[PDB]
Design a binder for this molecule. Structure first.
Ligand code: CUZ
Ligand code: CUZ
Ligand code: CUA
Ligand code: CUA
Ligand SMILES: [Ca+2]
Ligand SMILES: [Ca+2]
Ligand SMILES: [Ca+2]
Ligand SMILES: [Ca+2]
Ligand SMILES: [Cl-]
Ligand SMILES: [Cl-]
Lengths: 572, 572
């Protein structure tokens, strides 16, 4: 539970950043932040959102200075974390991102078409992560061209993204909306909760029905239908779309108690658990009974194997791999450990007690996460509870309070609070992985994708990134290529004309671990990272004529303050 | 050294964010991050840099998505922290910010004229903080208009800003350049180190002279000159400028060993210590002899009371108020604890040993900080060393490694490492203040300056922010006012035309601490924080026609997911 100087943490903790936009890498159990991976935010340090490389990844036809990421998930191979990728959603601007875990950098960014607010997101587990499943939370007209604002004709869709290409594979139109989602351990099924079957906007209308549902998607059927060419296209997108509304061979709507929120798959792979929220219950769906349900051999609610009452406001559930479940109670402000088997029995008529313990969590719990819970290897050692209010938990810091993610020891019979972790800009879910499930690199290979465009442009200009220090003029454009080692840039002076579009390419020749350099052009709003053997580039417009210094902003040597240069801008 | 769940830290830690741009509030000794104060960066969560209130403070005639802050400092009254303000520099885009500690929010941002790269920054101690002292590191021509790029005619200036106004008071032209700075405990003197007395750009040139210097500013004489109107102006700035180059009544250049970096004032108020960097020494200037020096009664070097050899790469120094100093040795990678009195004796010819202890610090130490070291009340209990490399200290996370700020117990006669705190995007210096020296507010007053502009616009529109939910049309401009409580916005639908400049004002009526709300408009790159009793606005351009949902991104209630609305954009 304690990590001293010189010792290392056992698990990596990938924390969603919420509406702050980044992904935070913490070490567990110390609970310290080890790194920040910019994603939908603009990082002033590494220059993510500023550098050309990052802007090419972000794409889009408009620059977004924000994002809202909630659900980080790691790629899998046969129900086990393989550590290659980490995917996460953007509810603010309808995007999904992919992070390269070998270097901890956003790799791909995709815009989901004809849909709005990507919220729920999870990956396929078996045979491996071929599909990234995403939920669009808000219903809108199809197409959303402004010719019909009515909620009557507003719908949302379920989106499947090809994990290796990050291109959308297909979308499934559904009824109501989509909140959270999860997949099984076969690859055939995926499911999502719904809280707005009423497709209303006002509160009163979204709480109307006593029950909403859990939509089950038959990925096998859906994929077949798309392969056979039986699909349509919406708007200007070419993405294959299938209809999963009403009586469809692609979907099954299992009614669930009021505005269900979380939806979690158990490690054993036989239960999809929907969280009640408005209903003080949880709904346990049997994945084993799904085949018959899609064959109309049984009734919709026959898939329900249990629906135990736990407390007020259940939002998310996680598992210890020992048959117990842990659910957060928002309103009662606590986490509840209960036995699934006992819940199955109690549901059938028994009197067995299924609730084993209730631990008071410090102010309104949201997501819940137990180590390796999303894999066959759920070890039941650690449980993280991410609360939404910190009230008096930490020193006062103004009207804006931090969130409080508490580390709880669940390796034993009883839950024991171990650490109170203050956090910024509301994280939602998080995922822990064993130190050995990730294979990190320390220095870049010169053919790395993260700067393939840089050498492509270099080849055209006839420059050798690893040794040249040239200035190339191309009309109003000016490309400057520099090299960096020790406390010096391969170039300490260059001239351009006011208004010129200047691009600077910095290639870091140092090969010693942790010897990172930076580049910052004064009064030009430019900054970027250049770790060992990397090439990064940033373009800006030269300001009014005069002298503008540039310097390394990454302390790299005793002569760091001196790692400088001057850009001379003359009247055009 | 340990803070258990439920307990509180003893000191607040205000960490600089380096080129990441923000200020970080940590609790000591837990070393946990309690809050992030956006300053020069753009926060996707609170909306700093996106909201109208922040953009108004940011000012400027250009948008900057980046910043580089190194030195956070807290206002004082008679040499003691008074907890009213925190000031920090921006080296990337030449600015200085001010933070209101009552709400932990940036309150003022000033662009410094005719100068570049604000680095060193520190406050006046006695009688109180009236002046904010800033160093500009890179020499530029005066004025910088592109008619003469030569280094021969490039210079920099020492800037004093009025703390309460945040308007530049005056500037002092100097020879060489300016690195770091500190002030005495009387109000008469301020001093800065210089590493480029050669005013060169190439590495070898900046190291040419055996000695550089510490420039001492007679503030008393500089203010007198300004009051009498004996000053000039440069370029478009009306700021008073005095010449401190060569033989001046305003300045005194005390030669100090090779490219000195840090410059710290001892708690007893009698020493200005310059760190030798390229020289394995430290230079102790007696502030007591400064009066005679500005009267030419003594020689420049006569002010030097000690110049002890400590190790390779001394960068910064701090004190325990017990007569001992602690210096970081960048190259030898360690912190050195030496007695100041003994160094004085040794310099006089004695044989006494001044070095008490050398503690290996984990990889290249930068800034150094002892609790309350900048005030008369230096308690000498905690020491924070902020290193630039972490290497094997934490779990691997890619080519980019985190920094390592180590907490050291110094209350005893022996330094003892206690904690290894990983940190993102290079923080430089930090300041620790007692829990009781900070008086924070939990909710806003409806007359808070932070939204004065909002209610001034409200008045003109004849709207009562605390109870109105109206849509005021102003040609192509549309001002939407909404109220907010529990899980609902006071409005759930409004219309505008494609291309309309929409400004959404949100007022949070809840009175319960920690009950914060947010606002985000899907696909419009907008997000903002609205804490208890606060009003905030954000303006954007209505995109193409169609439906666009807006929602609360600050988990505030069990019905948080439902706290939404719809903006309908119709073809113009
Ligand atoms: Cu925070 S939802 Cu978005 Cu995940 Cu419970
Ligand atoms: Cu800017 S320097 Cu030793 Cu302060 Cu980092
Ligand atoms: Cu490169 Cu500092
Ligand atoms: Cu207001 Cu969530
Ligand atoms: Ca409902
Ligand atoms: Ca909160
Ligand atoms: Ca020098
Ligand atoms: Ca570093
Ligand atoms: Cl979930
Ligand atoms: Cl300093």
């Amino acid at each position: 539970a304690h990590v001293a100087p010189g010792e290392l943490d056992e698990y990596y903790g990938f924390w969603s950043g919420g509406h702050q936009g980044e992904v935070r890498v913490l070490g567990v159990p110390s609970m310290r932040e080890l790194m920040r991976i910019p994603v939908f935010n603009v990082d002033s340090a590494t220059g993510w959102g500023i550098t050309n490389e990052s802007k090419e990844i972000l794409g889009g036809d408009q620059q977004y200075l924000n994002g809202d990421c909630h659900h980080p998930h790691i790629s899998m191979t046969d129900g086990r974390y393989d550590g290659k990728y980490l995917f996460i959603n953007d509810k603010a601007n309808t995007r999904v991102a992919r992070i390269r875990l070998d270097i901890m950098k956003t790799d791909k960014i995709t815009h989901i078409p004809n849909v709005q607010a990507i919220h729920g997101l999870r990956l396929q587990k078996v045979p491996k992560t071929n599909y990234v499943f995403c939920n669009a939370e808000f219903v809108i007209p199809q197409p959303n061209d402004g010719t019909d604002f009515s909620l009557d004709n507003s719908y949302t869709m379920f989106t499947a993204i090809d994990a290796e290409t990050m291109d959308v594979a297909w979308q499934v139109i559904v009824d109501g909306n989509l909140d959270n989602t999860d997949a099984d351990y076969t690859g055939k099924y995926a499911t999502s909760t719904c809280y707005n079957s009423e497709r209303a906007v006002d509160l009163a209308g979204t709480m109307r029905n006593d029950r909403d549902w859990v939509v089950v998607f038959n990925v096998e059927r859906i994929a077949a239908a798309v392969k056979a060419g039986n699909f349509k296209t919406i708007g200007d997108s070419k993405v294959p779309v299938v209809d999963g509304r009403g009586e469809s061979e692609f979907t099954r709507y299992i009614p669930v108690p009021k505005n269900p929120h979380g939806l979690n798959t158990s490690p054993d792979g036989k239960y999809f658990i929907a969280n009640g929220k408005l209903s003080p219950t949880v709904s346990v769906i049997a994945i084993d009974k799904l085949d018959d349900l899609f064959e109309d051999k049984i009734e919709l609610r026959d898939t329900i194997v249990a629906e135990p009452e736990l407390g007020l406001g259940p939002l998310h559930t996680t598992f210890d791999g020992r048959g117990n479940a842990y659910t957060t109670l928002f309103i009662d402000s606590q986490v509840c450990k209960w036995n699934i088997a006992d819940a199955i029995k109690h549901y059938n008529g028994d009197r067995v007690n299924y609730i084993r313990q209730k631990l008071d969590v410090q102010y309104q719990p949201g997501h819940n996460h137990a180590s390796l819970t999303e894999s066959r290897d759920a070890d039941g050692k650690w449980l993280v509870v991410l609360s939404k209010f910190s009230k008096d938990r930490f020193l006062p810091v103004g009207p804006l309070h931090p969130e409080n993610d508490q580390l709880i020891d669940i390796s034993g019979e009883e839950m024991k609070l171990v650490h109170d972790g203050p956090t910024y800009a509301e994280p939602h879910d998080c995922i822990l992985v064993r130190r050995d499930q990730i294979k990190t690199k320390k220095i870049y290979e010169r053919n790395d994708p993260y700067f393939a465009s840089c050498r492509a442009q270099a080849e055209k200009d006839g420059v050798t990134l690893e040794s040249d220090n040239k200035v190339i003029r191309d009309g109003n454009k000016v490309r400057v290529y520099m090299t960096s080692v020790a406390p010096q840039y391969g170039m300490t002076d260059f001239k351009v004309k006011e208004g010129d579009e200047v691009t600077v390419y910095i290639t870091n020749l140092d090969m010693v671990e942790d010897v990172t350099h930076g580049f910052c052009m004064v009064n030009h709003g430019v900054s970027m990272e250049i770790s060992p053997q990397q090439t990064a580039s940033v373009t800006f417009t030269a300001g009014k004529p005069g002298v503008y210094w540039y310097y390394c902003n990454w302390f790299c040597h005793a002569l760091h303050m001196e790692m400088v240069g001057r850009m001379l801008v003359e009247a055009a």
